[PDB]
Symmetry: D5
Subunit: 147 residues, 10 copies
Amino acid sequence: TSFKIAFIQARWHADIVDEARKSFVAELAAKTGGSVEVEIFDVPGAYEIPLHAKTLARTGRYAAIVGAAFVIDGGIYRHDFVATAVINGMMQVQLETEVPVLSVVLTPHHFHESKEHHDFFHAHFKVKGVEAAHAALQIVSERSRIA
Amino acid sequence: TSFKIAFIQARWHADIVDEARKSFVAELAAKTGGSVEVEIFDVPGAYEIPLHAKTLARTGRYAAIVGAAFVIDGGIYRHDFVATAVINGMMQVQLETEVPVLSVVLTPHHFHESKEHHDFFHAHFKVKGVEAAHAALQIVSERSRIA
Amino acid sequence: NKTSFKIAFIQARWHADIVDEARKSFVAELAAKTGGSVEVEIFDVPGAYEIPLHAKTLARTGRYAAIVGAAFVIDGGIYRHDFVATAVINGMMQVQLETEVPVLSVVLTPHHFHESKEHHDFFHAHFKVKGVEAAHAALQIVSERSRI
Amino acid sequence: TSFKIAFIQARWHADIVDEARKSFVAELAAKTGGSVEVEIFDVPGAYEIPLHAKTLARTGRYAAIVGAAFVIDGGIYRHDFVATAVINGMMQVQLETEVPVLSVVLTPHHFHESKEHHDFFHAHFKVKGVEAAHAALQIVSERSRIAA
Amino acid sequence: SFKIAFIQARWHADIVDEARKSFVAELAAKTGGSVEVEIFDVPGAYEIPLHAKTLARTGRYAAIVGAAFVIDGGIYRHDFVATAVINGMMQVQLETEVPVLSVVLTPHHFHESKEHHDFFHAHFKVKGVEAAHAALQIVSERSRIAA
Amino acid sequence: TSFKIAFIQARWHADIVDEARKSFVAELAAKTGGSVEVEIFDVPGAYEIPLHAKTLARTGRYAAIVGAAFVIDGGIYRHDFVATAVINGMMQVQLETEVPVLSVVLTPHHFHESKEHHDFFHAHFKVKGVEAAHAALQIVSERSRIAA
Amino acid sequence: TSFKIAFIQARWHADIVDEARKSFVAELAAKTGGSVEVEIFDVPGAYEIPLHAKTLARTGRYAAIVGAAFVIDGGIYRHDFVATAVINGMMQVQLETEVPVLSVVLTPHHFHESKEHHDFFHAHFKVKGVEAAHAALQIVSERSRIAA
Amino acid sequence: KTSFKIAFIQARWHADIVDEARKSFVAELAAKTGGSVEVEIFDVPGAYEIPLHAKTLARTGRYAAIVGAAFVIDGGIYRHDFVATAVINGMMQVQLETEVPVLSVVLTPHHFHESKEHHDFFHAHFKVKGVEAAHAALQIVSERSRI
Amino acid sequence: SFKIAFIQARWHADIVDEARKSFVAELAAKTGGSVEVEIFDVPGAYEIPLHAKTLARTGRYAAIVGAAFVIDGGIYRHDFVATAVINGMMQVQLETEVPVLSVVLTPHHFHESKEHHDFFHAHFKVKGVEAAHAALQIVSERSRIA
Amino acid sequence: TSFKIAFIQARWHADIVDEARKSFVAELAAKTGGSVEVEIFDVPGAYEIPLHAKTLARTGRYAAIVGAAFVIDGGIYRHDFVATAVINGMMQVQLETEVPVLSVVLTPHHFHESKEHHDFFHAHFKVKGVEAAHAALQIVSERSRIAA
Ligand code: NA
Ligand code: NA
Ligand code: NA
Ligand code: NA
Ligand code: NA
Ligand code: NA
Ligand code: NA
C-alpha cells in the first residue's frame, strides 16, 4: 500500500490553499501511517499546475497527483478562462499520463476578500483536503483492482 | 454472456446514482436476460470517470462503458469546470479508444439537498438508468452492424 | 455531367418525430439536386452524445465524403444539456479534423423548447429547412474538398 | 516579400462576410502589390472552416490561412456551440500545422436581420478585413523572422 | 542563466506594454539582469498560442509569456477568442513541456474611457510583475524537479 | 348580458398584434353573438397603453380593457424596461380604476425579423387572442358575480 | 373565531393549482373544523388576481385573501413581467386595504410541460397549499392580536 | 390643421447622440405639421431628472404630450439599470398621474463602449428614433383628443 | 419612552433568530434597556410589509425591522417575493414616515447544507448588531431633525 | 434670498462616499459663490435614504436633495433589491415632494474590497461628486426657469 502522491499547490490564496494540503496530508498519513508519501510542489498559479502535473506524472513515481488552488473571481479579470483551462488541463494530463489527478482546484460562486468569506473557506478547504485524501486513496486503490 | 459493459459510478450522491445503476443493470437483464453482463466500478467523483473509462475501455474487455454521477451545483463552488471536463473527457476517451462511453453523468439545473429534490432524482435516475440501458444495447448493436 | 458520392446521416433517436424531418428533408433535396447521384445512408444512434464516435467510425471507413449528425439537443428543464451539446458539437469537429471527412452539423439546440403543439410544430417544420440547407452544405463542401 | 494566403469564407451572410474579404484583398493588394496572393475558398458554414483550413494548411502552399464568417445568434438555435468549435478548431489546426490561421469569424453580441444591424456590420466587416490583412502580413513576417 | 519569450499582442499596446515593461524590469532587478527576455509582437491574442508553440519548440526558452488585453469589444464576442487563446497556451505548454505563463487578461468591464484605460494601464504593471515573479518561480520549481 | 371592451393595440408589429385583435374580436362575437362590442384604440407603442387604458377605463363605459402589443427585444435597445413599466402599468391602471385590464402585451424570448419567427407569432397571437377573449368574458362575468 | 378567506385562483394549470386549493381548504378545515370559511374565486390567469383580491378585500368580508396560480415560463413568452406585476399587485393591494393577501402564486425555476414536472408540482402544490393554510391562520390571528 | 405644444426633455448626457433625436424629432414635426406643433426643449442633467421635470411640465397643461430623451448606457463602471428603470417607470408614473402622454426616447442600448463605430451608429440611429417619437407624438395626441 | 417593532418571518427561524436575539442584545446594550423591542412573529417575508404598516400606523413604534431569510429554495423563484417585500417595507415607510429597517436578507447562495446553515446562523448575529446600530442611528437622526 | 441642498450620505463606505460629498460641496461652493448651504445628513445605509429624503424634502427647506451611498454586491447577500428600492425611492419621493432628488447612490459592477478597487472608487467618487454638484445646480436652475 506504499505509494507516492504529488500535491501541487498554487502560491495564491495560500492561507486557504494550505488548509487543504495540511488536511490532505493529515488524512492521508493518518490512514497510511507514512505508507502513502505525499510529496509537495509549489507552483505560481493554478495555471501553472497542469504542466507540472504532467511532468511529475511522467516520472512514474506517483500513483496520483493533486492540484490544489483557489481560483476566484478576482473582481478585476475573468477567472473562468483559466479555471477552465486548468480543470481541463489536469483532466487531459491524466488521460495522457494514465495517472489519476484529483482536483482540489476550487472556484467558489462568491468570494470577496473579507473575514467572513476568508474564514469560511480557510475552514472548508480543510474538509476538501480530507475529502481529497479519501478520494486520492480510493482511486489509486480501485485502479490497482483493475490492473 | 454476449458482451460486457463497465458501469463507472461516482461515490457522491450514491443514494441517487445507485438508483440509475440499479435500473440500468435491471433493464439490460429485462432486455438481454443476462446475455449482457454489467460490471460495476466505483470511483470517488465524476472527475475520475474519464480516466477510469479510458483505462477500462482500452482493456478491450467492454463493448461499452457507462459513466454515472450526479454532478450538481454544490452550493459552494462551481460544478461546471468539473462537469465539462467530465462530459467532454468521456467524449474524448471514447473517440480515442472507439469504445462507446454513454453518459449518465447528469447535472440538474437546481438541487438543494432537500427532501423534495432528493426524492425527485432518486426517482428520476431510475428512468435515466433504463434509458442508458436501452441506449447502450442500441449503440452497441448499431456499431457491430457497421464493421 | 454528374459526379456521385456517399453521405452517412447519423441521427439520435430522441425527438425522432422532429429529427426525422431533417433527415427526410435532407434526403429529398439531394434527390432533387443529385437524383440519386448522391446516396444518403442513415444510421440510428441513441443520443446526440453517441454521434461523434459513430461519425468517426463511419468516416474512417472512407465510404463517405461527408458525415451528417442530426440531433435535437434540448434543455429538458431537468438536466443541463449544454455539457453534452458542447461535447457533441466539439466532438464532431474533432472527428472531422481527425478524419479529414466533413461532418456537417444538424445537431441543433433551440433557445427555448417546452413539449407543446406550438413548439413541436415549429421545429417539426423548421427541421425541414435545416435539412435542405444541410444538403446544399453537404454538396457544397464535398465538391469544394474535391477541387483540392 | 511574396507568399500565399488561403482565405476560407462561409457562404452565410455573404453580403457582410464578403466585405471583410474584399477589404482583406484590397489591403494586401496595396501593402504588397501583387506579392501576397490571396486564394479564396468558399465553404457552406463556419463549421466547415476548421477542417478546410486544416486541409489547405497541410499543403504547405499557404503562409497563413484566414477564416471569415459572420456567426450570429439566429434567434432560433444557439449558435455559440458552433462558434466555440470553430474558433477553437482553427486554433487547433494552426497549432497542429503551425500555419497561422487568422480569425475573422466574428460573432456579434446582437444582430436581428434589420437594416441598421445589417448595414453596421456590412460596414464594419470592411474594417475587420483590413485588420485581418495587417494581422496576416504581420504574423507572417514575424514568423519568418523568428525562423531565421 | 536562462531566456524567456515574451509574446505580446499589438492590440491595446499602451496597456499590454505596461505589463511587459515591468516584467522585463522585475526580471532585471530580480536576476541582476541574468535572464534574457526576448520580446515578440503578434497581431492579437489569437496569434499567441501558435507563436508560443513555435518559440517554445525551439528549446531556447525556459518559459514563455503570453501577454494580451482581450476585452469585450462591445461589438463582437471576445470570450470565444479568449478561451481559444487561454486554452491554447495551456495546450501548447503541455505539448511542449515549456511553461507558458498567461498575462492574457480579460477584464470584466472596459469601455476605453479615461478612468478605465488608466486603470488597466496601471494594473498591467502590477500583473507584469507577478508574471515576472511567476516565471522565475515556475522555471526554478521545474528544474528543482529535473534534478 | 352585454358590455363593452376597450381593445388597445400598439401600432408596432401590427401584422402580429393584429392576428390577436382579430381572433379576440371574433371569438367574442362568435360566442356572445355580437352582444359584446369590442372597441379598438390604436396607440403608438406598448408604452402608450397604460395611460390609454386608464383614460378609457375611467369613462366607465368598458367592463374591461385589453392591452395588446408585441414587445420584442429589437436587438438594439433593451425592451424589458418598457415591458416592465407596461405590464406593471396596466396592472396599476386596473387597480386604480377597478376595471379589468387583460394583457396581450407579449414579450417573446426571441424574435428576429425572420420568416419562421414572424409566421410563428402571426399564428400564435391568433391563439393568444382567443384566450384573452375568454379571459375577458371570464373576469368580466366573474367580477359581476362577486358584485351581486 | 369565524372569519372568511377569499381564495382566488387562476384556471391555467388547474390540475396543479387545484391541489393547493384542495390542500388549503382541507387542511384549513382540519385545523378549524369549518370555523374558517374558505370562499373560492376563479380568475382567468394570475394577472387578474390582484384586482379581484382588491375588490374582494374592499368588501371587508374576508380576514385574508389567497392568490393561487402557477406562473410558468411558457417557453414562448417571458412570464416574469406578469409574475412580477402580480406578486407586486397582491403586495400593493394588501398594503392598500390592510387585508392580508398571501401568495401561492408560484413561479418555479424550471417546468417544461411533461409528466416529470407535472407530477412533482401537482404533488408539491399540495404542500404549498397546506403551508398556505397555516400561513393564513397565523397571520389572520397575529394580526387580530395587534387589535387588542 | 390642429396645433399643440410638446415638451421635449433631454438629458445632457451623451447629447452627442441624444441631440440627434431631438433634432430629427423637431425636424419631422416641422416637416409633418408645418410648425403647427411646437416642440419646446428642456435640458436636464441626467435621465433620472426627467420624470420630475416631465411631471412638473405636465401639470402645467400646456403640453398635449411630453417627451423624455436620453441615452442611458452602461458606463461600464456603475450599473445603469437601476436608474434606467426608475426613469422609464417614472415617466410611466407621471403620465398616469397627469394623464399627459410622456413618450420615451430614453433608450438604453445593449452594448456601447464609446467606440467611434458605436458612437456613430447611435449618433446615427437616434435620428431614426427621434423621428419615430414624432410620429408617435402626433399619433397619441390625436388619439387622445378624440376622447 | 420609545419602542421598536421587530417583524420576523418564521421560515429559517433558526437563522433569523440570531439576527433577532443579536438585535435585541445590542439594542438593549447601546441604550441601557431604555428601548423596548416588540417581537412580532409573522408567516413569511411577504407578510412583513403589511404588518410593518399596520404597526407603523399605531404610532407606538419609532422604527420597525423586517427580519427574514429570503432564499432561492431551488424549486420556485424567490426574487419575486423578495423584491415585493424589500420594496414593500420601503413603501410602507414612506407612507408612515416611520423607519423600517431591512433584515430581510437574500443570500447569493444558500443550499440547505450544514456549512451554509452554519455560516449564516453566525452572520445573522453580525447583522442583528448592524440592525440595532442603524435603528438607533436613524431613529436618532430623524429626531435630530423635526 | 438663499438656498440649501440636502445631502443625505449613508454611513457605509465613508472613505469613498465622503469623497463624493467633499467634492460635491467643494464644487457647489465654487459655482455658487458660497451661496448654497449643503446640509449633511448621515444615514445608516442607502435604504434609510429615501425616507430621510422625503422627510427633508417636505420641510421645503431644500431646493434639491442628493442621496449618496456606495451600494455594492457584498458577495454574501444580494444588493440589487435594496439598491432598487433606494433608486426607486428617491424617484418616488422627488415625484411626491416635487423636490429634485439626485442620486449618488452608485452600484458598481464589480467591487471586491481590494486595493485597486478601493482606490479607484475613492478617486472616482470625487468625480461623481462633482457631476452631482453640476447636476444639482443645473436642475435647480432648470426648474427655476420653468415656473414663469
Ligand atoms: Na448518453
Ligand atoms: Na453544418
Ligand atoms: Na485574428
Ligand atoms: Na520587439
Ligand atoms: Na405568503
Ligand atoms: Na414611445
Ligand atoms: Na425606453
